[PDB]
Symmetry: C2
């Protein structure tokens, strides 16, 4: 499994980017822009405490309250949430279970968060809010299968959640809601290939799921729905390059997809759709630096891509689509990924 | 009340703009881009039938299904919906009541559509889905007050719905959910001023509501929350000009607000934030043409603003942020606004 993303990042409901990572104390720490603009100063690192043994995953509730999901030292799923939009935090609370992957988090069309994680049986399990942005949570429920990567989840343009994960054959597999807001899940389906990273999945400007992963030759590959929220899927297509981290995907303000990954020389590289969301892909270009994690990309309140990656000093570094000079957010981050 | 918008417009879940207007037969007709790109050809006008006596208002359910709300010849609220995302339509169904305004439509954080309309008592009434993107609908319920414009609704950055309407003193009044997804509504509050148009309301890139309306001198005015999802509100500020239609507001792909209105010479004019979502406003610039409605603006799948307005031939005309030459979508539209 290619070197993981080290932070979970979100553009908050007041347009300030907030980043969540794991400190050398295995606590979750966060850092937020002081202002909703490219090149803003930062609050600096503030601890949410806890003791995590996964990548922490933040998600924005449909009422704007941030909620962080992470595996605990007891291998249960834990969460912590803002008690008001962009204000103070709850205490950590256990959602129980015994999980063996990073959590994958998405919200249903009814505002109920759904959390996916590998179980001790290596099956895909999930648990969900029983009310919009609210407990109590459901029972843990199995979607079966046997998976060998962290899962990734995205909503279809018709409101059906869809989960992607590597199988025991190293192929990309996926499973989906057959109706929004439901525990009517499909059978597992193979999209084939051989992937050597977690998959990442995004929704296109024309309402199709598209999945990115590293292949056996360490090139970036992608595959997509050929119709909105539906099969058949394309063949795998190479975006070439040689990448030494998981790829991170993000949509530009104009709908153009862009992918970030570490190269052989440990520099940050990127590749993007040109002209429009239906235009031809660029060639790889370097953004220099020396990074010791996969990059994480998010669009800021100015419509500019922002990229975060750990540096050789274990600080989190930032670069944005001006591109800007590399800037340090300081801190000391560890890779707590549950699957490496 | 300044000349109304003549169409309801939405960027659908597969990135194609769809427009809804009223034909000379008082039926609702729609027209959709063939492709998710600026300057796309159009399907041409297709009837949803019905007999409406308001502006029709389309809203996208959280599962991607379009739903149109309009007053019927019996003065009840009627609706019609897609049975699948971007596919076929239901039959018209009555939601009952007796309404005296255009409907104002928004979705709660739990995916339940809320529809607001003036009653025969000139109070603000509302009715809502009792389940995410689903009937059955609630009882009609009064929020009291006495209003003299069509209502406008927007969600706060903390998930609380907020409704704006002109009062008997010609001031801008507003009322809000004190909690998301609830019938706990606040008291009416006056934002003062004297408005001679329906208000339009939008959410800023930094999570604040901002309201635009024509003033007694026919200048464009605006007022805003000074903090995310909260008071106090700013003073009214003039954006000047002399406008002969309701203003239409839209957010650029980069968060910059932009307003469209008809000028004294019946040309389309616009004014925009420069530099960023926190930058200084431009001066008014003409986009020429001769329009016989207020304009309606929406962002397309290429991140470009698209504007629609009725022409002197009663066709719907289109111009986009290339700016492009004016292009006719043909058809023959009427202003069915319930308040003129
Ligand atoms: C604006 C343009 O956008 C591309 O997607 C890429 O990030 C380029 O480096 C940038 O200059
Ligand atoms: C790109 C730029 O955006 C502005 O908001 C305005 O629409 C201008 O006319 C356009 O040229
Ligand atoms: Na990262
Ligand atoms: Na937020
Ligand atoms: Na920055
Ligand atoms: Na939620
Ligand atoms: Na759903
Ligand atoms: Na920002
Ligand atoms: Na219009
Ligand atoms: Na749609
Ligand atoms: Na167009
Ligand atoms: Na809905
Ligand atoms: Na709500
Ligand atoms: Na479009």
């Amino acid at each position: 499994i290619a070197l993981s993303e080290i932070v979970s990042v979100v553009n908050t409901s007041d347009g300030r980017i907030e980043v969540f990572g794991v400190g050398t104390d295995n606590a979750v720490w966060h850092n937020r822009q002081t202002a909703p603009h490219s090149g803003s100063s930062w609050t600096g690192w503030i601890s949410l405490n806890g003791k995590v043994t996964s990548k922490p995953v933040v998600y924005i509730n449909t009422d704007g309250r941030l909620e962080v999901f992470a595996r605990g030292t007891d291998n249960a799923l834990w969460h912590i949430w803002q008690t008001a939009t962009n204000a103070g935090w709850s205490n950590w609370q256990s959602l129980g279970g015994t999980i063996t992957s990073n959590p994958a988090v998405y919200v249903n069309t009814d505002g109920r968060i759904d959390v996916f994680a590998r179980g001790t049986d290596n099956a895909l399990w999930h648990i969900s809010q029983t009310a919009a942005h609210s407990g109590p949570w459901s029972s843990w429920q199995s979607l079966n299968g046997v998976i060998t990567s962290n899962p990734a989840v995205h909503i279809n343009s018709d409101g059906r959640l869809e989960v992607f994960a590597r199988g025991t054959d190293n192929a990309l597999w996926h499973i989906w809601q057959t109706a929004p807001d439901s525990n009517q899940w499909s059978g597992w389906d193979s999209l084939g290939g051989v992937i050597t990273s977690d998959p990442v999945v995004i929704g296109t400007a024309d309402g199709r799921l598209e999945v990115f992963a590293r292949g056996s030759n360490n090139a970036l590959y992608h595959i997509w729905q050929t119709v909105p929220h539906g099969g058949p899927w394309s063949n795998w297509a190479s975006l070439n390059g040689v990448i030494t981290s998981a790829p991170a995907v993000v949509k530009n303000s104009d709908g153009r997809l862009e992918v970030f990954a570490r190269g052989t020389n440990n520099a940050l590289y990127h590749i993007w759709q040109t002209v429009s969301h239906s235009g031809p892909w660029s060639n790889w270009a370097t953004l220099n630096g020396t990074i010791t994690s996969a990059p994480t990309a998010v669009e800021d309140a100015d419509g500019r891509l922002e990229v975060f990656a750990r540096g050789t000093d274990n600080a989190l570094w930032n670069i944005w689509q001006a591109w800007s000079a590399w800037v340090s957010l300081k801190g000391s981050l560890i890779d707590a990924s549950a699957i490496k």
